[PDB]
Amino acid sequence: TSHDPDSGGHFGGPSGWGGRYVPEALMAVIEEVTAAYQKERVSQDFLDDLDRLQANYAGRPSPLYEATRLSQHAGSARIFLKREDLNHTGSHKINNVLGQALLARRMGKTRVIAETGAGQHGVATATACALLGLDCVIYMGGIDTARQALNVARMRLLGAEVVAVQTGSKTLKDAINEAFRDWVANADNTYYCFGTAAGPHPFPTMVRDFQRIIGMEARVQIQGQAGRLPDAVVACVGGGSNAIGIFHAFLDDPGVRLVGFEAAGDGVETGRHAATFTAGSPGAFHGSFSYLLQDEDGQTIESHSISAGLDYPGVGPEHAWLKEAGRVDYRPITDSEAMDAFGLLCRMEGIIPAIESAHAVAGALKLGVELGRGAVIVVNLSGRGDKDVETAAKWFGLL
Amino acid sequence: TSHDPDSGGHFGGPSGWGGRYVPEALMAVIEEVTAAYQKERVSQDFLDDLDRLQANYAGRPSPLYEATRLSQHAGSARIFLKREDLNHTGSHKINNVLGQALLARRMGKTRVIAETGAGQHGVATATACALLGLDCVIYMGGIDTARQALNVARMRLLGAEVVAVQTGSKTLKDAINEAFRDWVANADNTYYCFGTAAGPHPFPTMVRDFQRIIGMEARVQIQGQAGRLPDAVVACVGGGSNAIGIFHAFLDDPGVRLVGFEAAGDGVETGRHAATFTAGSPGAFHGSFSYLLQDEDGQTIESHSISAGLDYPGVGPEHAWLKEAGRVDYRPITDSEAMDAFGLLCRMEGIIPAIESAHAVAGALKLGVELGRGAVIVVNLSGRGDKDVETAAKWFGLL
Amino acid sequence: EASRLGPVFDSCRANNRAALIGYLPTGYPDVPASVAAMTALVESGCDIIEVGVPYSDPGMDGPTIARATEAALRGGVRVRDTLAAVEAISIAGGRAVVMTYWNPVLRYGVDAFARDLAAAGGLGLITPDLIPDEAQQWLAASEEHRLDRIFLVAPSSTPERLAATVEASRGFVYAASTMGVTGARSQAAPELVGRVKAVSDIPVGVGLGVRSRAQAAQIAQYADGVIVGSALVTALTEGLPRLRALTGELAAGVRLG
Amino acid sequence: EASRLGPVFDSCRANNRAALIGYLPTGYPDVPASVAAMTALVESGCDIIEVGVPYSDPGMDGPTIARATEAALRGGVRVRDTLAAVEAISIAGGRAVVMTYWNPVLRYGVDAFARDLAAAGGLGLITPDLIPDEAQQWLAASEEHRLDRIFLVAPSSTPERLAATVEASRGFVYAASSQAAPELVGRVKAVSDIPVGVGLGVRSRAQAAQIAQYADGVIVGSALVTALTEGLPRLRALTGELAAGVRL
Ligand SMILES: C=C(NCc1c(COP(=O)(O)O)cnc(C)c1O)C(=O)O
Ligand SMILES: C=C(NCc1c(COP(=O)(O)O)cnc(C)c1O)C(=O)O
């Protein structure tokens, strides 16, 4: 609780970051979800149910692997990969989904809806709903259905309805808008399983609480394998769930640097990026007061990235607060930098990462050069790259 | 041990299952590999290296999951899934590959070759070779390259060369033939990383020794979760590696039924199957004396299955021995049965299995109805279904 | 003292009718045509005009309004064009409130936007994604610049939240029938108005996807104002004469003796 | 007392030459044509004929032989057709051995195949996928039905395994593969006086002559199949050229 927001969902004071910038039509169900979560987060039977699924279904704990063959590309620093790529469904998304799906059942909801960009949250949600016998509808931007088609097919096999969103940029922000519209209309029976650490209270806190396990495990593992706390912990930042998940356990370790890496696309100078902290500014978007990419009038600027999971012009409010506090540094990584790292990891360690995660790996390599020989850097390897194989093969001229 | 063959590779004495039916041209390298294995299997440095990789890289142990929503479809029996699907690369193949790849490096070999049908062994081999910096060439039947195309692209991204084999049935047996010819020509520098529990000595024993970890984990896990040894342990059977891996630790527990399920394709009566034990007979093929599908003159009959991994007319010699002894029963499962189970596992447990593994699940459902309420059945869930999503979506009319 | 929109509702209630509240988005089909359209609403008998601020991600707008706001943004519409629209409405003898999502207001500056809206003759602000829980700055700016604050209530609203939302509102409370976009063609609306009347005497405007005289008349039996949006946009797309005719039919609907 | 092929190699060694050993697969392009081709080899001066048994998965066969055996199998060739081929060769005055992968022999019955091979006038068996380590049944059948047993050695063969393979062989040793062939023949000569045949993808008269300088037999197969595919006259011409090659 030291790092938690107030009862209104605000970080850093009464007007700060987060809150609930939603219509009154959603407030009954938002208050219903908030009350249900406050009740269940302190119920041992709930935590036991979540733990049992984490262990036996999802295969936790995920291991921590020292990628020694990266060292020479990282200034002889020691890169440790936190292997969320090995989870059921292939990403960290399943952690949050199991929690929220269990909560949906506890609340008596019969229908679950979700947004997805990379399709990993969509697949995770479909997975949990199949497991728990819930009806499932996934909203996905039309551009994303085409570039993450493996995940569309998986969702469909799992019994989910997939709705391709054609509005706006046809990517994650637009999928979120449609899912929101569904929830407004169907609040009585429908639970909205939100997939990142953004949105109105209680979502930033709840999503973060279910992703905390990553950091809790990593903090124990790194002390065991390296003999000490790391010099840095790093992750990629879409809306912010995998990053906040791994960071949280190290917040009160003052010697541990925390670095989030955001998608810079073609470059921050080009206007084709998703570098929210580098190029954005404070505003109200998708339920929260946080940073977003916006023009002089406050219109959302459409994001671009080769990574569908980082192609989002906003970011979660806890990250905005941590940025303002000076606790986390957030830095841009381009498409090219990320793909170089994607390729390097395949070639050197035999791990095919998600293109999202390759941004974190790319950032870690640069940080390694900065910190130098023997520095211990823990990297959240948020997911695997099966969905991205076609894109990557094309990038590297392998068909 | 009690279950090992003699120094010539024969199981069961004088019947002679196994052995070495190879040309003299291969015997120098076969004897080289045999000697290197015998040396390294008792070297603590080697076992430490293998262990470190299994834990931190591959993510062992895999969990054991009670699939309670399957129970009503299995006569109210209790189906426990041994989750090899959650391993790095998405199957059991990685277990054997890390062992053999470490061994290749110990021997000073600079080139690794492998056959693949489903592409999982190919991907695992490529993975290990990336990790250890070995040149890699994978042989894959042309029909398999088309129906497991996701794995071809993964192999290529991992830095492996892939050679499409167009001879014979253009499936696993033909890939094996080509890899064999490569080894004959390039024995001095090349290690053959054989992916199943068949072949000449030492491969059946060595592959099984590296896969034994599955059963050893399962035997401990089931006693922990269920409070006793299972009533049965079951697996699908291609050449036999995942089955022998999970079975081995239960061989000396007399109350534990062991059932292998082989691919019956369109049905055993149709001549379009891979049901080696059901329809085959003893013979020498691919380096061993074991069972194979063969005609009246001893010509190999081409196998057929919807599953690329089980589409092999042979089977490993240790299985022939266990069948002869009456320790394991081997039963046919059709394409249709397997796909029904595929779909059921998706809908009930949110797990997308490999079509290979779906055969084992289908068999488990039938065995559950035989054994009845409360019977404890451990099923080896050998792989995940990423590679099969297109096939399955097409099967279920989901496009 | 009294709300800015108080005299309009008192005047309507004295003539045994509801107020006709008409929505158009600034910049559709372009900026000059939209201003001409809003002027036409004043001339055709709209008591209050909701000047919509086009937003890039309008979660509560229906398809008709969403396509129109997209088109406005492609045309290059700006937030200050909405202030110009309010001026033109005020000059024509009309009464304007602004409907906007909150971020354009934050970006402009809450105090500054309230100041400039009041300077243009604007009477208040409708805030579909701002709940009273987050409205501290807006409440202060609203009191300082004498602007009405129209929050929304929904059928799902709990007793507590409904009471708190009505208490926080000045001018009128917008009750709507849930899903995004103007209503198009159920006892939810009278029930919701009924719940607002049980705790307060503030006027209640009702939005229900109204498209015809008959629907406006039904709503005027129980509601103090009839809110129309989607149908006005559809009318304007066909032409300015079609808008005048429709507005005239709705103006007849709100009157009932 | 002595091997079945011993008098052939002694007769060659007395005429200061190597034996020409010719391989054709039974049933290519069909069964009657293949027998007519094998007869042509006897007439064109092949000292020994290797009658190939087409196998469905021929691991050691190169592309030319593999495609021919595939074609023979499509045509419906049977193991008995090989025994008929051996008989026709023997009646024509030729000397035949059978080359086969092991499973067809197991299926037939090892003893029964030996018995029937011997009754057809067959002199022995070449076994590319049978090492002595697995050859217990074959050794017994070989001794009983008086058949030569030609095992293969390779450049990679260890000293111990080379010795064991040569010791287990009767008739000749098939040395299969730059300077590798003469070196391998040299290593067999150092432990035994058994004749050594060399198979090296021989295509021409000059190549057969080079091999005849050190080897007791020159084995030709791929080139004979290629010749037969063009025509039966082309096979005669090539076989006659190779016959001249071994006499230098
Ligand atoms: C947006 C989606 N994924 C984002 C994602 C991210 C970025 O999202 P975070 O919420 O910042 O963790 C990182 N890694 C992987 C493997 C991802 O799939 C999605 O799948 O719906
Ligand atoms: C033959 C190959 N796979 C076989 C396979 C099998 C059958 O092979 P076994 O050797 O019987 O375990 C089972 N499960 C999975 C997931 C598989 O991929 C291959 O990928 O090369």
Tab-separated table of C-alpha atoms in Angstrom, chain C:
chain	number	residue	atom	x	y	z
C	1	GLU	CA	-28.122	33.287	-7.579
C	2	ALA	CA	-29.892	31.635	-10.470
C	3	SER	CA	-28.505	29.455	-13.292
C	4	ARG	CA	-27.798	30.992	-16.724
C	5	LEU	CA	-30.329	28.645	-18.416
C	6	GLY	CA	-32.967	29.137	-15.658
C	7	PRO	CA	-34.932	31.873	-17.523
C	8	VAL	CA	-35.236	29.683	-20.668
C	9	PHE	CA	-36.807	26.767	-18.763
C	10	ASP	CA	-39.045	29.098	-16.716
C	11	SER	CA	-40.203	30.727	-19.988
C	12	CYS	CA	-40.867	27.300	-21.582
C	13	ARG	CA	-42.680	26.033	-18.457
C	14	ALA	CA	-44.888	29.188	-18.553
C	15	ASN	CA	-45.846	28.405	-22.203
C	16	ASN	CA	-46.647	24.748	-21.320
C	17	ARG	CA	-43.796	23.252	-23.363
C	18	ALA	CA	-40.342	21.731	-23.190
C	19	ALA	CA	-37.182	23.439	-24.402
C	20	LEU	CA	-35.855	22.164	-27.740
C	21	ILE	CA	-32.121	21.531	-27.310
C	22	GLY	CA	-30.293	21.121	-30.649
C	23	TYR	CA	-26.812	19.631	-31.157
C	24	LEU	CA	-24.500	20.284	-34.106
C	25	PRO	CA	-20.746	19.685	-34.320
C	26	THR	CA	-18.523	22.614	-35.274
C	27	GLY	CA	-16.829	22.199	-38.687
C	28	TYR	CA	-19.287	19.767	-40.328
C	29	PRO	CA	-19.395	19.772	-43.303
C	30	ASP	CA	-16.945	22.723	-43.049
C	31	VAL	CA	-16.581	25.635	-40.571
C	32	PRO	CA	-18.660	28.279	-42.451
C	33	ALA	CA	-21.462	25.805	-43.344
C	34	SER	CA	-21.707	24.619	-39.701
C	35	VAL	CA	-22.053	28.213	-38.447
C	36	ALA	CA	-24.789	28.828	-41.068
C	37	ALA	CA	-26.472	25.610	-39.876
C	38	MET	CA	-26.342	26.661	-36.193
C	39	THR	CA	-27.769	30.078	-37.092
C	40	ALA	CA	-30.583	28.260	-38.934
C	41	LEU	CA	-31.398	26.352	-35.698
C	42	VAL	CA	-31.807	29.656	-33.823
C	43	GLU	CA	-34.071	30.979	-36.620
C	44	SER	CA	-36.093	27.698	-36.744
C	45	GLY	CA	-36.922	27.712	-32.983
C	46	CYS	CA	-34.162	25.999	-31.001
C	47	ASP	CA	-34.258	27.317	-27.442
C	48	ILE	CA	-30.715	26.077	-26.662
C	49	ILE	CA	-27.866	25.029	-29.016
C	50	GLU	CA	-25.258	22.413	-28.020
C	51	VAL	CA	-22.114	23.349	-29.917
C	52	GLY	CA	-20.133	20.099	-30.255
C	53	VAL	CA	-16.312	20.154	-30.106
C	54	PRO	CA	-15.019	17.434	-32.460
C	55	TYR	CA	-12.736	15.014	-30.619
C	56	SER	CA	-10.371	12.399	-32.104
C	57	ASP	CA	-11.625	9.548	-29.855
C	58	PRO	CA	-15.293	10.260	-29.012
C	59	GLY	CA	-16.367	7.201	-27.018
C	60	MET	CA	-19.946	8.305	-26.301
C	61	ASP	CA	-20.858	9.587	-29.808
C	62	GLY	CA	-22.983	7.372	-32.086
C	63	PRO	CA	-22.062	6.533	-35.719
C	64	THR	CA	-23.826	9.535	-37.331
C	65	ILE	CA	-22.114	12.016	-34.977
C	66	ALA	CA	-18.789	10.124	-35.072
C	67	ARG	CA	-18.507	10.193	-38.909
C	68	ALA	CA	-19.400	13.904	-38.887
C	69	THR	CA	-16.783	14.790	-36.236
C	70	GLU	CA	-14.181	12.759	-38.196
C	71	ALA	CA	-15.060	14.775	-41.315
C	72	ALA	CA	-14.755	18.051	-39.374
C	73	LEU	CA	-11.294	17.060	-38.128
C	74	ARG	CA	-10.186	16.139	-41.681
C	75	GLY	CA	-11.373	19.641	-42.655
C	76	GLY	CA	-8.975	21.125	-40.051
C	77	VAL	CA	-11.481	22.248	-37.381
C	78	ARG	CA	-10.013	23.877	-34.258
C	79	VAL	CA	-11.253	24.412	-30.685
C	80	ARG	CA	-11.385	28.189	-31.189
C	81	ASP	CA	-13.780	27.603	-34.139
C	82	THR	CA	-16.251	26.383	-31.459
C	83	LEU	CA	-15.806	29.702	-29.606
C	84	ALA	CA	-16.452	31.556	-32.906
C	85	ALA	CA	-19.603	29.428	-33.407
C	86	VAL	CA	-20.834	30.417	-29.921
C	87	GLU	CA	-20.239	34.104	-30.770
C	88	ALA	CA	-22.227	33.804	-34.022
C	89	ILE	CA	-25.051	32.032	-32.131
C	90	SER	CA	-25.079	34.784	-29.450
C	91	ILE	CA	-25.115	37.556	-32.111
C	92	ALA	CA	-28.093	35.854	-33.849
C	93	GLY	CA	-30.173	36.016	-30.601
C	94	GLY	CA	-29.536	32.378	-29.661
C	95	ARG	CA	-28.332	30.627	-26.528
C	96	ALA	CA	-25.309	28.336	-26.716
C	97	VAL	CA	-23.729	25.717	-24.478
C	98	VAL	CA	-20.652	23.714	-25.486
C	99	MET	CA	-20.494	19.903	-25.427
C	100	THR	CA	-16.943	18.606	-25.232
C	101	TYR	CA	-14.816	15.729	-24.065
C	102	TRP	CA	-12.510	16.874	-21.275
C	103	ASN	CA	-8.990	16.746	-22.777
C	104	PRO	CA	-9.487	19.627	-25.236
C	105	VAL	CA	-10.529	21.704	-22.191
C	106	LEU	CA	-7.421	20.604	-20.186
C	107	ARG	CA	-5.135	21.419	-23.140
C	108	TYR	CA	-6.685	24.871	-23.611
C	109	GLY	CA	-6.631	25.454	-19.830
C	110	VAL	CA	-9.797	24.980	-17.754
C	111	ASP	CA	-9.929	28.521	-16.326
C	112	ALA	CA	-8.987	30.083	-19.687
C	113	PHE	CA	-11.591	28.073	-21.627
C	114	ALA	CA	-14.301	29.023	-19.099
C	115	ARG	CA	-13.235	32.694	-19.365
C	116	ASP	CA	-13.292	32.705	-23.180
C	117	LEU	CA	-16.546	30.698	-23.417
C	118	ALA	CA	-18.242	33.208	-21.094
C	119	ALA	CA	-16.762	36.105	-23.124
C	120	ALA	CA	-18.293	34.670	-26.337
C	121	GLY	CA	-21.739	34.616	-24.615
C	122	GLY	CA	-21.621	30.893	-23.852
C	123	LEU	CA	-23.946	29.804	-21.049
C	124	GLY	CA	-22.473	26.494	-19.934
C	125	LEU	CA	-20.676	23.255	-20.589
C	126	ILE	CA	-21.877	19.667	-21.138
C	127	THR	CA	-19.226	17.156	-20.029
C	128	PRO	CA	-19.897	13.521	-21.071
C	129	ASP	CA	-16.528	12.120	-19.833
C	130	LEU	CA	-16.149	14.369	-16.748
C	131	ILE	CA	-17.849	13.121	-13.585
C	132	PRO	CA	-18.149	15.364	-10.490
C	133	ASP	CA	-15.478	13.202	-8.742
C	134	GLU	CA	-12.817	14.763	-11.082
C	135	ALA	CA	-14.483	18.186	-11.533
C	136	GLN	CA	-12.722	20.325	-8.839
C	137	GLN	CA	-11.071	22.771	-11.311
C	138	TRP	CA	-14.232	22.932	-13.422
C	139	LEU	CA	-16.448	23.671	-10.411
C	140	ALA	CA	-14.149	26.581	-9.472
C	141	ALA	CA	-14.040	27.926	-13.058
C	142	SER	CA	-17.803	27.441	-13.414
C	143	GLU	CA	-18.553	29.553	-10.301
C	144	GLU	CA	-15.975	32.223	-11.228
C	145	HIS	CA	-17.160	32.717	-14.855
C	146	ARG	CA	-20.909	32.155	-14.223
C	147	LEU	CA	-21.304	29.100	-16.456
C	148	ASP	CA	-23.804	26.283	-16.058
C	149	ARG	CA	-22.444	22.761	-15.552
C	150	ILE	CA	-24.444	19.994	-17.146
C	151	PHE	CA	-23.384	16.541	-15.975
C	152	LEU	CA	-24.944	13.326	-17.294
C	153	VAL	CA	-26.946	10.688	-15.439
C	154	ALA	CA	-27.736	7.185	-16.719
C	155	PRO	CA	-30.337	4.475	-15.982
C	156	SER	CA	-27.555	2.443	-14.295
C	157	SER	CA	-26.664	5.343	-11.927
C	158	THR	CA	-26.799	4.312	-8.253
C	159	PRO	CA	-28.954	6.374	-5.831
C	160	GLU	CA	-25.821	7.907	-4.260
C	161	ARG	CA	-24.180	8.891	-7.548
C	162	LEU	CA	-27.417	10.216	-9.025
C	163	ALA	CA	-27.926	12.472	-5.979
C	164	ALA	CA	-24.275	13.649	-6.105
C	165	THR	CA	-24.470	14.322	-9.879
C	166	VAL	CA	-27.705	16.335	-9.606
C	167	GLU	CA	-26.303	18.317	-6.642
C	168	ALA	CA	-23.167	19.145	-8.700
C	169	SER	CA	-25.176	20.241	-11.789
C	170	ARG	CA	-26.389	23.769	-12.581
C	171	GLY	CA	-28.747	24.669	-15.458
C	172	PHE	CA	-29.954	21.176	-16.349
C	173	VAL	CA	-29.123	17.482	-15.894
C	174	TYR	CA	-28.637	15.493	-19.106
C	175	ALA	CA	-30.290	12.129	-18.783
C	176	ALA	CA	-29.582	9.791	-21.581
C	177	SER	CA	-30.544	6.317	-22.429
C	178	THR	CA	-27.177	4.676	-22.257
C	179	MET	CA	-25.373	3.560	-25.449
C	180	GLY	CA	-23.392	6.007	-27.589
C	181	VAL	CA	-24.903	8.172	-30.400
C	182	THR	CA	-28.188	9.920	-30.816
C	183	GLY	CA	-30.998	7.586	-29.882
C	184	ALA	CA	-32.988	6.680	-33.048
C	185	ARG	CA	-36.574	5.416	-32.328
C	186	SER	CA	-38.845	1.552	-23.365
C	187	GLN	CA	-39.688	3.047	-19.965
C	188	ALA	CA	-36.061	3.789	-18.922
C	189	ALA	CA	-36.183	7.520	-19.749
C	190	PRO	CA	-39.323	8.515	-17.772
C	191	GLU	CA	-38.104	6.347	-14.850
C	192	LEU	CA	-34.722	8.110	-14.853
C	193	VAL	CA	-36.311	11.573	-15.032
C	194	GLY	CA	-38.637	10.438	-12.205
C	195	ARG	CA	-35.638	9.588	-10.012
C	196	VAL	CA	-34.065	13.034	-10.631
C	197	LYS	CA	-37.334	14.813	-9.747
C	198	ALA	CA	-37.509	12.913	-6.411
C	199	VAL	CA	-34.298	14.637	-5.120
C	200	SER	CA	-34.247	18.042	-6.904
C	201	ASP	CA	-36.216	20.659	-8.910
C	202	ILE	CA	-33.437	21.158	-11.510
C	203	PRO	CA	-34.605	20.873	-15.138
C	204	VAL	CA	-33.961	17.543	-16.884
C	205	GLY	CA	-33.121	17.277	-20.592
C	206	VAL	CA	-33.656	13.898	-22.253
C	207	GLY	CA	-31.730	12.368	-25.151
C	208	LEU	CA	-33.246	9.291	-26.779
C	209	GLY	CA	-32.241	9.386	-30.475
C	210	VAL	CA	-35.170	11.595	-31.345
C	211	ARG	CA	-35.960	11.865	-35.100
C	212	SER	CA	-39.602	12.961	-35.368
C	213	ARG	CA	-42.285	15.285	-34.019
C	214	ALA	CA	-44.125	12.413	-32.294
C	215	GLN	CA	-41.042	11.303	-30.307
C	216	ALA	CA	-40.287	14.866	-29.153
C	217	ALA	CA	-43.906	15.182	-27.945
C	218	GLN	CA	-43.738	11.926	-25.952
C	219	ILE	CA	-40.614	13.177	-24.144
C	220	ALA	CA	-42.129	16.644	-23.493
C	221	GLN	CA	-44.862	15.041	-21.289
C	222	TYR	CA	-42.289	14.298	-18.515
C	223	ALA	CA	-39.064	16.172	-19.448
C	224	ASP	CA	-38.217	19.895	-19.216
C	225	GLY	CA	-36.045	19.690	-22.345
C	226	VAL	CA	-35.855	17.497	-25.448
C	227	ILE	CA	-32.297	16.928	-26.730
C	228	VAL	CA	-31.793	16.183	-30.438
C	229	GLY	CA	-28.463	15.558	-32.172
C	230	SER	CA	-28.093	12.576	-34.512
C	231	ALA	CA	-31.209	13.525	-36.518
C	232	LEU	CA	-30.034	17.158	-36.971
C	233	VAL	CA	-26.699	15.971	-38.381
C	234	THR	CA	-28.487	13.528	-40.743
C	235	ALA	CA	-30.768	16.409	-41.828
C	236	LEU	CA	-27.836	18.797	-42.486
C	237	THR	CA	-26.031	16.151	-44.589
C	238	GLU	CA	-29.015	16.157	-46.983
C	239	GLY	CA	-29.202	19.973	-46.896
C	240	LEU	CA	-29.777	23.173	-44.973
C	241	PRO	CA	-33.475	23.333	-46.078
C	242	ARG	CA	-34.050	19.800	-44.702
C	243	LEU	CA	-32.601	20.926	-41.331
C	244	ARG	CA	-34.997	23.905	-41.176
C	245	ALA	CA	-37.987	21.655	-41.839
C	246	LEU	CA	-37.009	19.033	-39.279
C	247	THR	CA	-36.233	21.647	-36.592
C	248	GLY	CA	-39.673	23.213	-37.254
C	249	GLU	CA	-41.395	19.828	-36.758
C	250	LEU	CA	-39.502	19.233	-33.497
C	251	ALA	CA	-40.368	22.774	-32.311
C	252	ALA	CA	-44.058	21.857	-32.844
C	253	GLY	CA	-43.526	18.572	-30.967
C	254	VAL	CA	-42.240	20.156	-27.721
C	255	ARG	CA	-45.383	22.346	-27.541
C	256	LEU	CA	-48.437	20.686	-26.260
C	257	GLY	CA	-51.158	23.306	-25.616
